[PDB]
PDB file of C-alpha atoms in Angstrom:
ATOM      1  CA  UNK U 914     103.412  25.045 108.350  1.00  0.00           C
ATOM      2  CA  UNK U 915     100.830  26.765 110.583  1.00  0.00           C
ATOM      3  CA  UNK U 916     102.394  30.102 110.848  1.00  0.00           C
ATOM      4  CA  UNK U 917     101.558  32.243 107.711  1.00  0.00           C
ATOM      5  CA  UNK U 918     103.259  35.693 106.803  1.00  0.00           C
ATOM      6  CA  UNK U 919     106.724  34.727 107.881  1.00  0.00           C
ATOM      7  CA  UNK U 920     107.926  35.648 104.234  1.00  0.00           C
ATOM      8  CA  UNK U 921     106.979  39.421 103.650  1.00  0.00           C
ATOM      9  CA  UNK U 922     109.900  40.591 101.946  1.00  0.00           C
ATOM     10  CA  UNK U 923     109.274  37.964  99.020  1.00  0.00           C
ATOM     11  CA  UNK U 924     105.349  39.010  98.707  1.00  0.00           C
ATOM     12  CA  UNK U 925     106.319  43.024  99.586  1.00  0.00           C
ATOM     13  CA  UNK U 926     108.866  42.736  96.391  1.00  0.00           C
ATOM     14  CA  UNK U 927     106.288  40.591  94.126  1.00  0.00           C
ATOM     15  CA  UNK U 928     103.444  42.821  95.201  1.00  0.00           C
ATOM     16  CA  UNK U 929     105.356  46.241  94.351  1.00  0.00           C
ATOM     17  CA  UNK U 930     106.346  44.911  90.462  1.00  0.00           C
ATOM     18  CA  UNK U 931     102.903  43.759  89.959  1.00  0.00           C
ATOM     19  CA  UNK U 932     101.657  46.881  91.451  1.00  0.00           C
ATOM     20  CA  UNK U 933     103.990  49.206  89.128  1.00  0.00           C
ATOM     21  CA  UNK U 934     103.699  46.790  86.138  1.00  0.00           C
ATOM     22  CA  UNK U 935      99.358  47.443  86.845  1.00  0.00           C
ATOM     23  CA  UNK U 936      99.722  51.060  86.983  1.00  0.00           C
ATOM     24  CA  UNK U 937     101.878  51.487  84.216  1.00  0.00           C
ATOM     25  CA  UNK U 938      99.454  49.113  81.549  1.00  0.00           C
ATOM     26  CA  UNK U 939      96.509  51.873  83.964  1.00  0.00           C
ATOM     27  CA  UNK U 940      97.967  55.067  82.455  1.00  0.00           C
ATOM     28  CA  UNK U 941      97.299  54.010  79.039  1.00  0.00           C
ATOM     29  CA  UNK U 942      94.096  54.670  79.338  1.00  0.00           C
ATOM     30  CA  UNK U 943      94.075  58.115  80.155  1.00  0.00           C
ATOM     31  CA  UNK U 944      93.517  61.580  77.728  1.00  0.00           C
ATOM     32  CA  UNK U 945      96.280  63.475  78.055  1.00  0.00           C
ATOM     33  CA  UNK U 946      94.470  66.691  76.765  1.00  0.00           C
ATOM     34  CA  UNK U 947      93.528  65.524  73.820  1.00  0.00           C
ATOM     35  CA  UNK U 948      89.633  64.185  72.339  1.00  0.00           C
ATOM     36  CA  UNK U 949      89.964  60.646  72.883  1.00  0.00           C
ATOM     37  CA  UNK U 950      92.339  58.285  74.539  1.00  0.00           C
ATOM     38  CA  UNK U 951      92.379  55.977  71.501  1.00  0.00           C
ATOM     39  CA  UNK U 952      94.764  57.083  68.339  1.00  0.00           C
ATOM     40  CA  UNK U 953      92.500  54.812  65.472  1.00  0.00           C
ATOM     41  CA  UNK U 954      89.441  56.977  66.477  1.00  0.00           C
ATOM     42  CA  UNK U 955      91.674  59.895  66.345  1.00  0.00           C
ATOM     43  CA  UNK U 956      93.183  59.175  62.670  1.00  0.00           C
ATOM     44  CA  UNK U 957      89.444  57.935  61.401  1.00  0.00           C
ATOM     45  CA  UNK U 958      87.684  61.158  62.003  1.00  0.00           C
ATOM     46  CA  UNK U 959      90.428  64.014  62.011  1.00  0.00           C
ATOM     47  CA  UNK U 960      92.625  65.657  59.816  1.00  0.00           C
ATOM     48  CA  UNK U 961      96.196  65.513  59.129  1.00  0.00           C
ATOM     49  CA  UNK U 962      96.793  69.507  60.470  1.00  0.00           C
TER      50      UNK U 962
ATOM     51  CA  UNK C 269      62.428  79.581  59.130  1.00  0.00           C
ATOM     52  CA  UNK C 270      61.754  81.112  62.356  1.00  0.00           C
ATOM     53  CA  UNK C 271      63.657  83.816  63.700  1.00  0.00           C
ATOM     54  CA  UNK C 272      67.202  83.423  65.882  1.00  0.00           C
ATOM     55  CA  UNK C 273      65.230  84.293  69.129  1.00  0.00           C
ATOM     56  CA  UNK C 274      63.174  80.926  68.475  1.00  0.00           C
ATOM     57  CA  UNK C 275      65.385  78.731  66.196  1.00  0.00           C
ATOM     58  CA  UNK C 276      63.927  75.644  65.482  1.00  0.00           C
ATOM     59  CA  UNK C 277      65.441  72.279  66.700  1.00  0.00           C
ATOM     60  CA  UNK C 278      64.432  68.706  65.304  1.00  0.00           C
ATOM     61  CA  UNK C 279      65.684  64.924  65.800  1.00  0.00           C
ATOM     62  CA  UNK C 280      67.198  62.785  62.614  1.00  0.00           C
ATOM     63  CA  UNK C 281      67.429  59.407  63.143  1.00  0.00           C
ATOM     64  CA  UNK C 282      66.624  55.533  62.059  1.00  0.00           C
ATOM     65  CA  UNK C 283      67.074  56.803  58.621  1.00  0.00           C
ATOM     66  CA  UNK C 284      70.564  56.157  56.401  1.00  0.00           C
ATOM     67  CA  UNK C 285      71.705  59.418  54.742  1.00  0.00           C
ATOM     68  CA  UNK C 286      75.246  60.631  52.606  1.00  0.00           C
ATOM     69  CA  UNK C 287      76.577  63.707  52.904  1.00  0.00           C
ATOM     70  CA  UNK C 288      79.134  63.583  49.598  1.00  0.00           C
ATOM     71  CA  UNK C 289      76.215  63.990  47.485  1.00  0.00           C
ATOM     72  CA  UNK C 290      75.645  67.044  49.241  1.00  0.00           C
ATOM     73  CA  UNK C 291      79.206  68.176  49.514  1.00  0.00           C
ATOM     74  CA  UNK C 292      80.265  67.796  46.184  1.00  0.00           C
ATOM     75  CA  UNK C 293      77.366  70.266  44.747  1.00  0.00           C
ATOM     76  CA  UNK C 294      79.196  73.697  46.068  1.00  0.00           C
ATOM     77  CA  UNK C 295      75.349  75.072  46.034  1.00  0.00           C
ATOM     78  CA  UNK C 296      74.425  75.410  49.413  1.00  0.00           C
ATOM     79  CA  UNK C 297      76.228  78.017  51.767  1.00  0.00           C
ATOM     80  CA  UNK C 298      79.932  77.092  52.624  1.00  0.00           C
ATOM     81  CA  UNK C 299      81.486  73.698  54.804  1.00  0.00           C
ATOM     82  CA  UNK C 300      83.947  74.591  57.410  1.00  0.00           C
ATOM     83  CA  UNK C 301      83.356  71.283  59.933  1.00  0.00           C
ATOM     84  CA  UNK C 302      84.980  70.844  63.246  1.00  0.00           C
ATOM     85  CA  UNK C 303      85.569  67.440  65.024  1.00  0.00           C
ATOM     86  CA  UNK C 304      84.795  65.006  62.142  1.00  0.00           C
ATOM     87  CA  UNK C 305      86.527  66.168  58.366  1.00  0.00           C
ATOM     88  CA  UNK C 306      83.952  66.809  56.212  1.00  0.00           C
ATOM     89  CA  UNK C 307      85.240  64.466  53.691  1.00  0.00           C
ATOM     90  CA  UNK C 308      85.306  61.412  56.149  1.00  0.00           C
ATOM     91  CA  UNK C 309      81.558  61.838  57.612  1.00  0.00           C
ATOM     92  CA  UNK C 310      79.978  58.866  55.227  1.00  0.00           C
ATOM     93  CA  UNK C 311      82.326  56.162  56.534  1.00  0.00           C
ATOM     94  CA  UNK C 312      81.308  56.398  60.012  1.00  0.00           C
ATOM     95  CA  UNK C 313      78.428  55.751  62.090  1.00  0.00           C
ATOM     96  CA  UNK C 314      77.207  58.001  64.366  1.00  0.00           C
ATOM     97  CA  UNK C 315      74.513  57.467  66.511  1.00  0.00           C
ATOM     98  CA  UNK C 316      71.615  60.252  65.489  1.00  0.00           C
ATOM     99  CA  UNK C 317      71.591  63.913  64.143  1.00  0.00           C
TER     100      UNK C 317
END
């Protein structure tokens, strides 16, 4: 009860999973060399070619 | 109109214009526009000119 940090394995697993998911969802906002990071603007501003 | 060495710059803002009325009349120069496609200029609401 009094002493904490006795469950390092479970916390490490949970933190690894959450960090991986967060990095995946954050990678969605990159530009990847295009002219915009959102496709709705691209389809509403450019030509199909 | 001034020379190329003294090209005239001006600001256009706070108005409401249209481009199809100018686009359809094939009278002024020739249109080749990057970024926004010429035919889709009217529908979007960019800040100023």
